[PDB]
Amino acid sequence: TAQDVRQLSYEQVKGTGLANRCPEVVSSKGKISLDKTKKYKVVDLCLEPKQFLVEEEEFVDTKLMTRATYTLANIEGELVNENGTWKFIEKDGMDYAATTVQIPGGERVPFLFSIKKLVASLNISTSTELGGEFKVPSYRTGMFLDPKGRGMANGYDMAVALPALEADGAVGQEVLRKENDKVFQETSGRIELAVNKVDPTSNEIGGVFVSEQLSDTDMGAKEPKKLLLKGVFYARILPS
Amino acid sequence: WQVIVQLVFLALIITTGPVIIVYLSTR
Amino acid sequence: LLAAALALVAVVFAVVLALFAAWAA
Amino acid sequence: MWYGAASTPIELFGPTRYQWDSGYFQQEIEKRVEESLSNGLSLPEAWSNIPDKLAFYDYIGNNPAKGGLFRAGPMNKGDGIAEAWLGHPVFQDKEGHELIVRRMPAFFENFPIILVDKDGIIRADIPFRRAESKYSIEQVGVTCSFYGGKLNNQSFKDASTVKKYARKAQFGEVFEFDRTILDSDGVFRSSPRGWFTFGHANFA
Amino acid sequence: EVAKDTNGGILNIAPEQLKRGKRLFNSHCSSCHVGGITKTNPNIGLDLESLSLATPPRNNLDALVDYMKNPTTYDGSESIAQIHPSIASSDIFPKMRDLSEDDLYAIAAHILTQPQIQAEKWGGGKIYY
Amino acid sequence: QLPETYNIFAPIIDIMPVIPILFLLLAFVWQAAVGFR
Amino acid sequence: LNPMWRQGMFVMPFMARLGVTDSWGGWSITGESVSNPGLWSFEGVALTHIV
Amino acid sequence: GRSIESTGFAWWSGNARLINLSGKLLGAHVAHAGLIVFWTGAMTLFETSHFIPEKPLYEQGMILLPHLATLGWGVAPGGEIVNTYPYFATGVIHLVSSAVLGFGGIYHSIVGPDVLEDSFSFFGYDWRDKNKMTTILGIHLILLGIGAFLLVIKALFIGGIYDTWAPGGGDIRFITNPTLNPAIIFSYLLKSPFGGEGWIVGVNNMEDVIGGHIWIGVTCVIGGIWHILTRPFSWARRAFVWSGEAYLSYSLGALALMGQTAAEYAWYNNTVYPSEFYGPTAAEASQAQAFTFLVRDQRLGANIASTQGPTGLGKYLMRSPTGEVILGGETMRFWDLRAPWLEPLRSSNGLDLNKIKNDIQPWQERRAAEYMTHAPLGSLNSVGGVATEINSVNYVSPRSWLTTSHFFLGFFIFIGHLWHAGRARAAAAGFEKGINRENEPVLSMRPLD
Amino acid sequence: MFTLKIFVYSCVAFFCSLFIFGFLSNDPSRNPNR
Amino acid sequence: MVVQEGGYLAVLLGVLFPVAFLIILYIQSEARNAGMREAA
Amino acid sequence: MEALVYVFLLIGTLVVIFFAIFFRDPPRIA
Amino acid sequence: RIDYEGIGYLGGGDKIDVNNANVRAYRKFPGLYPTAAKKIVQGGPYGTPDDILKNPELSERDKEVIKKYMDRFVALPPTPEYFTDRVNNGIYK
Ligand code: CLA
Ligand code: CLA
Ligand code: CLA
Ligand code: CLA
Ligand SMILES: CC1=C(/C=C/C(C)=C/C=C/C(C)=C/C=C/C=C(C)/C=C/C=C(C)/C=C/C2=C(C)CCCC2(C)C)C(C)(C)CCC1
Ligand SMILES: CC1=C(/C=C/C(C)=C/C=C/C(C)=C/C=C/C=C(C)/C=C/C=C(C)/C=C/C2=C(C)CCCC2(C)C)C(C)(C)CCC1
Ligand SMILES: CC1=C(/C=C/C(C)=C\C=C/C(C)=C/C=C/C=C(C)/C=C/C=C(C)/C=C/C2=C(C)CCCC2(C)C)C(C)(C)CCC1
Ligand SMILES: [Ca+2]
């Protein structure tokens, strides 16, 4: 489908929804050679979720609120054989996407579908599998402000709408401390791709991915929820 | 010195209207 | 998009159009 | 009622907005303290002679022009019931300049925290934007020492506590507050003076 | 009353030149340098302090006119004539085709005289509007 | 600019587009001259 | 630190302004302690107004 | 009649005295046309007189010259105004013609006969004569068709038209293969006016423009012939009010609609309105800012495809609701923009990240800077920039002038449509002068409750 | 979602047709002076 | 949401005390009206 | 649950309007 | 956070926290902006300021200028709040 996408024009794709879909590989035979001496590089890495599960106190199905803006693409990485084991080290690309789902009851669960700083060991054929750990930055960053003008790197440092509360010694606005002390909370979801299609002529791989991950905390005001993404992936092998 | 030319031309046009009216008002 | 939409639209429109055509007659 | 008179005492109806405007009580307290210094007494000994009542008058929470039309109840429903005078906080930089926190005017529901010296020059503040700031207490290095009151002769050098007492300082003198008894909502209410003036002006 | 060169050259400027310089600045610079911040890159403005900390320091008339002739990065390590309007690139920046040396010196005169009369306002931004 | 020839006709052209407005105004003059308006 | 004007009293200061400063409870808003204000305490003023 | 006693209308409503006077009415129309052509000529000569060679058109307050430049007169590749003489030519022609039309106007208004039905029979008419009206309508329709074919001829054979999408930057081009396919053209016609669609304003190539004018030329000619050689059917005769005021109201509604459409063309389209001449659109300028700082920050060593903004969305690059890779920030609303300086970087799935990383050209950066610094924002006294901006740049984009003015016009013209349509109905039925005291309809009606 | 679209389209076409063909039914004759 | 409880009372009392007032007047008004229209 | 009170007041107003329209005393010509 | 000890090293002070400060801060020292600042940020973070010079893809010009202002640098522990905005921190004018 990569050739198909190549043949398509912008006006033919714009609005259809194809722009958020990962290419397919119509071949389940052959193998991609990997000399353990030469360095490689995985390029055009595109995951496309299909399933978003949010665990409740088992994982339950949700409803997507943010439409077709969730797929990661053009992500870039070094494929280096370290001490015999094959390692993929994610670098550049569109390796994150803020998406919001809705669990039963109506509660919105926003999260940052991230694959940043991924280190994935390889265990390339249709039996090859890619598994591994990754960093998920804070959903909001330092300059972001809450509805009362409070943030990490800027904003008010107190509940400015309550001057009579912030007026006595000791306590204080210490109550509202939990909401006045914005925290950048890096977490970790942890993925696990799994190939299934390999085209040796075009050196393209694709197949299933599973990913696990951890999610939005409102700058340290609420507890995060575990989210579950079930999808397809695509990539290409390019020599260094 | 261009301003004077502009204002003279302006004066002539502006006056051109009412003059035609006055002229025909006599007849 | 689908043929069903055009079918229904043209159907209702043709119905009311015929009603009007009878009136005009 | 609003401007004050011999028939509207501040002990019965509360202080006026103009007393906060002119720093009436503030100037008085400074005068008494300096007089005590002339008598040979030290600074904390001078401030310790200051009554809690006078210090209470110099607090913006008792300013009748800081309330709201639909903020119902007594003033204690706002900041709470006044427990102690903490004493007078004196701010100083690393050079020893006596810094004063810019007092909140009655017009402003909120006010940026700015610590200014004797010549009205900005020496410290609490920055909105953190990056490229050049007056933060973490950078300038400011200390707060209380004279008189409950926190008498206590010094604070850590940036956190200094910033704390700075916000609180923009509201005038600092006091203790019981906000459990009446479940105070943390917002300022007007005095009987204010309500009277409002009601009677509109009725007029 | 500005700096002519890096050697301490000082020459007074009459309001005729200030007028021509202001007009030409507003005609050729004064988007971005609408007001001598820099809308296309606020990191490098026309404020006195930023000018003095450049290499070479554009704190003087000759350096400014030199910049208008052949502009460089803030560290002077590279040319930016293909991105920034100049005499050297008046072929792709046609608005620069009608500027003489007197014009460049007038514009520079304006830029250097502004921080002396408006103080913090020049290169200050919306803060001081 | 204008061709060098018709250069001399610059100020007059500066007044040329303002003429239709005058016509509007002229209507009122005409009316006031008659007895109406 | 908790006088009448901090407590939302609206008719109290008017009773206080003209002499009625004592209560039958044995207290005063001046801080003193009375044992018998007589008829014209706050409560007395209230009850007489009711009658 | 030229009095209240003789006509019933006052000096204000003075112009209504011309409703049944064919001669003086014709004089009014001709004189008015004279005023239009007058303004065209005079203003064109004004713009030519005030024009400065080495400045963009949109910096000099030009609205007429951009039209001529769009048609392909005196333009060099890129949108450089080299020859300003054909503009002078058109201006002069229009002006002199204005002398002719003016003479005719004054003649038929004052000198000639009031009624053209007496001395003549071809130029005379009764408003209630349907056949004559459809004949005139047909003639003028044929004229309009001829005009459309004039544009077509000019673009196909005589030099061509300025194409901003031309392979090599904006340049005049002769349209070799116009679009005659009905699927495409009428695909424009039956398309939504909402975001990403744009109805007929979303036309982005001169092939479709000129082909569209071929279609509209054929349609206008065939329709003209149709109305000249036929009479209105029964249903139309029953459905319409047949009087001068009614026709006036119809044309008013039409012109209101057209006014709105033109305002939208000026505001969103950059094909028939090249940004080289008219300046950038709002969309184009916002996208230009995002592009500009994307480039600046990428040059400073930031991986823009991975740069997380305060919200969690892409700071420079994100996705549109349908998946396309777009510029981040507020300009996410403007992701439907198509500009010749950006489309080189466009791929199948939107913006090509590789081309963004590697193949961004200096001229593109110059375009982005220029356009984001010449956004269509400015005050009434032509102070350029946002409302809080200070007095330095004298600038208001031509797009703003055109769009606002034509909204004003279209609006009041719609008001006029309501007014005259209503009065047409009331005058036709016979109660436009008040309620008959002896025939009050309500009094002959059963009460509501 | 498609059935909803069909429904709404049906309604719109219906009322629009009634409007258009309704106003074509000799509306100027609908006056008290007829 | 932490609201002022008295509000409830205020509102209802407010709303219901004139409402009743109006209704009272109206109905007696009409009664009298009827009487007068009847004996005419 | 002030929402209950708001809904009540709105419904009250709308009801008042409804009865003001369809239960008005008819105007009678002199 | 409410409190940050290394605020002064973000541009408004005499010294620069190489691990957290924005590129704009390096405009304080002639020669560093934009190239040296770019390479510095792109090569961070560092355990010690001197580690800056251990960065490949640094020209000799870069290393010269950087030494000078080596006396001008500090390496505080990297906090992601500022680290994420080392190029664009939402500040313009
Ligand atoms: C196709 C355009 C067109 C045409 C041919 C007519 C024709 C007519 N209109 Mg009409 N009208 C139009 C558009 C048009 N209208 C529009 C767009 C509106 C909405 C604003 C109206 C609103 C309107 C009303 C309300 C009335 C008419 C009436 C009439 C009749 C007499 C008009 C008259 O004597 O003018 C007289 C002209 C004037 C008094 C001049 C007034 C100038 C205006 C108020 C200022 C406009 C500002 C201008 C743009 C520039 C400002 C000047 C500044 C430079 C100093 C006549 C049949 C009358 C009617 O029904 O009689 C049968 C009537 O009462 N019109
Ligand atoms: C389609 C109409 C249109 C448009 C879009 C423009 C656009 C432009 N003109 Mg232009 N012009 C026009 C018609 C138009 N003009 C006409 C008809 C004339 C003949 C008088 C001129 C004469 C002219 C000159 C001489 C000049 C321009 C200039 C300009 C530029 C700056 C405009 C400016 O400062 O506006 C100022 C805007 C206003 C004063 C606003 C007018 C107020 C409106 C009409 C509302 C008032 C009416 C009132 C509310 C109506 C009452 C309603 C009633 C019905 C109840 C700009 C490109 C200048 C330029 O830079 O050119 C190189 C310039 O020097 N124009
Ligand atoms: C076959 C008969 C005939 C013809 C050829 C015309 C032709 C014309 N009439 Mg007309 N008219 C007619 C019968 C006719 N009329 C009748 C019976 C009446 C009722 C009395 C009128 C009433 C009438 C009025 C009231 C007005 C006109 C106007 C016009 C002109 C439109 C100009 C324009 O912008 O159009 C669009 C223009 C184009 C699309 C450009 C190309 C048009 C053609 C190809 C050439 C145009 C050149 C030039 C304008 C005149 C030459 C035309 C001629 C050679 C066919 C045009 C010259 C208007 C005008 O301004 O007249 C001067 C106007 O206001 N007519
Ligand atoms: C110059 C403009 C013009 C004008 C004023 C007229 C005027 C007229 N034509 Mg006509 N016509 C024209 C051009 C014109 N025509 C052209 C160019 C053609 C084709 C070559 C025709 C073909 C034509 C035929 C075949 C017939 C008429 C008829 C009529 C008469 C009845 C009008 C009617 O009921 O419309 C009402 C029209 C409609 C309800 C049609 C709706 C239009 C559809 C839905 C397409 C529009 C959708 C579009 C995509 C969206 C537009 C956006 C907008 C809604 C905002 C009337 C005198 C009739 C008549 O009486 O016989 C002479 C008749 O039978 N005309
Ligand atoms: C009806 C009427 C009216 C109106 C009227 C009108 C509107 C008229 C118009 C008229 C017109 C509309 C006219 C026109 C004219 C034009 C002309 C007369 C032109 C001329 C031209 C020229 C002169 C040119 C010259 C030149 C050249 C050749 C080129 C170069 C430059 C120069 C400039 C040198 C009124 C309301 C008032 C009232 C009365 C009646
Ligand atoms: C050139 C061009 C083109 C084309 C265009 C065209 C082709 C158009 C057409 C158009 C058309 C084709 C239009 C039409 C329209 C229509 C209308 C607008 C209608 C209206 C109607 C009416 C108005 C009616 C009314 C009524 C009713 C409804 C009721 C009854 C009565 C009556 C009848 C009144 C294109 C796009 C390609 C491109 C661009 C350029
Ligand atoms: C083309 C040309 C020419 C021609 C020109 C013309 C055509 C002119 C016209 C002009 C005109 C056409 C003018 C007019 C004017 C008007 C007026 C001046 C009017 C009025 C004013 C006023 C001021 C008024 C006032 C009033 C009244 C009386 C009434 C109402 C009220 C009031 C008070 C508003 C010549 C030969 C130079 C040659 C060159 C070129
Ligand atoms: Ca497998």
Q: Does L10 touch chain D (CB under 8 A)?
A: yes
**What does the DSSP 8-state code read for residue H107?**
I
Distance D203 CA to ligand 8 centre (A): 85
> In angstroms, rounded to a whole number, what is the distance separating the alpha carbons of residues L56 and L49?
15
User: Best substitution site from H189, H226, H260 to test ligand 4's pocket, by max atoms within 8 Å of Cβ?
Assistant: H226
φ/ψ of H173, rounded to 5, equals -145, 140
Distance from CA of F35 to the nearest CA of H (A): 10
How far apart are alpha carbons L65 and L73 in whole angstroms? 12
Contacts of A154 in chain L (CB under 8 A): 90
Integer Cα distance of A161 and D111 in angstroms: 11
What gap in Å lies between CA L37 and CA L66, rounded to an integer? 9
Do residue D185 and residue J6 have CB atoms under 8 angstroms apart?
no
Residue E43 and residue L36: Cβ atoms within 8 Å?
no
Question: Which chain H residues have a beta carbon less than 8 Å from that of F13?
Answer: 42, 45-46, 49
Q: How far apart are CA D15 and CA D21, in angstroms?
A: 11
- Token output for K24: 């008005």
Contact between chains at L84 and A183 (C-beta distance less than 8 A): no
Reported as type and span, the H/E element at residue L35 is helix L35-43
The method recorded for this entry reads X-ray
Specify the length of chain G in residues: 51
Two tokens at F4?
A: 């060098």
- Nearest partner of A227 among A77, A116, A95, A64, judged by Cα: A64
Pairs of CB atoms within 8 A across E/L? 40
CB neighbour list of residue H2: distance below 8 Å, 6 or more residues apart: H17
Structural contact between residues D176 and D83, judged by C-beta atoms closer than 8 angstroms:
yes
Question: Within an 8 Å CB–CB cutoff, is residue E43 touching chain L?
Answer: yes
**H113 CA from centroid of ligand 1 (Å):** 25
Measured in angstroms, how far is the CA atom of residue H428 from the centroid of ligand 1?
A: 20
Residue E106, H or E segment: helix E101-117
Q: Is H233 on the interface with I (CB under 8 A)?
A: no
Nearest-CA residue for ligand 6 atom 20 is H254
Q: H194, exposed or middle or buried, with CB in 10 Å at 0-12, 13-18, 19+?
A: exposed
Distances (CA, A) of H327 to A73, D10, H304: 16, 62, 10
Report the residue from C2, C13, C19 with minimal CB separation from I13: C13
Question: Among residues H155, H47, H49, H32, which one has the least CA distance to residue H105?
Answer: H32
Specify the pairing of strand L16-17 against strand L73-74: parallel
Q: Which site among H392, H396, H397 would you substitute to test the E interface, given the most E Cβ atoms closer than 10 Å to its Cβ?
A: H392
Whole-number Å distance, alpha carbon B3 to ligand 2 midpoint, is 21
Between chains, do H300 and L39 touch, taking CB under 8 Å as contact?
no
> What's the gap in Å between H236 CA and the centre of ligand 3?
26
H312 φψ region: left (φ > 0), alpha (ψ -120 to 50), beta (else): left
- SS3 string, L43-59, reads HCCCCCHHHHHHCCCCC
CA–CA distance, A18 with A23 (Å, rounded to integer): 10
Q: Does the C-beta of H190 come closer than 6 Å to ligand 4?
A: yes
Q: What is the DSSP letter of G4?
A: G
Contacts of K26 in chain H (CB under 8 A): 447-449
Residue type, H363: W
Size of interface A-L (CB pairs under 8 A): 31
The alpha carbon of G49 and the centre of ligand 3 are apart by a number of angstroms equal to: 97
Residue A160 with chain D: CB contacts under 8 Å: 110
Three-class DSSP category at E11: strand
Chain J CB contacts of K2 below 8 Å: 1, 3, 7
List b or e across E55-91, with b for residues whose CB sees 16 or more CB atoms inside 10 angstroms: beebbbbbbbbbbbeebbbbbebeeebbbbbbbbbbe
Q: Is E9 annotated as a binding residue?
A: no
H305:A74 CB<8 A: yes
Q: Distance from A116 to chain D by nearest Cα, in Å?
A: 26
What distance in Å separates the CA atoms of residue A118 and residue A113, rounded to the nearest whole number? Answer: 12
| Touching chains, B (3+ CB pairs < 8 A) | F
- Please check if E32 is assigned to a binding site: yes
Report H helices in H120-243. Answer: 130-156, 182-189, 206-228, 234-239
- List the resolution, Å: 2.8
Tokens for A134?
């990754």
Chains I and C touch (3+ CB pairs under 8 A): yes
Nearest alpha-carbon partner for H401 in H49, H60, H28: H60
Query: What type of residue sits at position B6?
Result: Q
Kindly list the partner chains of chain A, i.e. chains with 3 or more CB atom pairs below 8 Å. Answer: D, H, L
Q: Are A204 and D116 in contact (CB under 8 A)?
A: no
Whether the upstream peptide bond of residue F3 has omega within 30° of 0, thus cis, is no
Write out the H or E segment, with its range, that includes residue D56.
helix D52-57
Tell me the nearest-neighbour CA distance from I12 into chain H, angstroms. 15
Place of tokens 């204010």: D194
**L23 Cβ under 8 Å from any chain H Cβ:** yes
Nearest-CA residue for atom 36 of ligand 5: F27
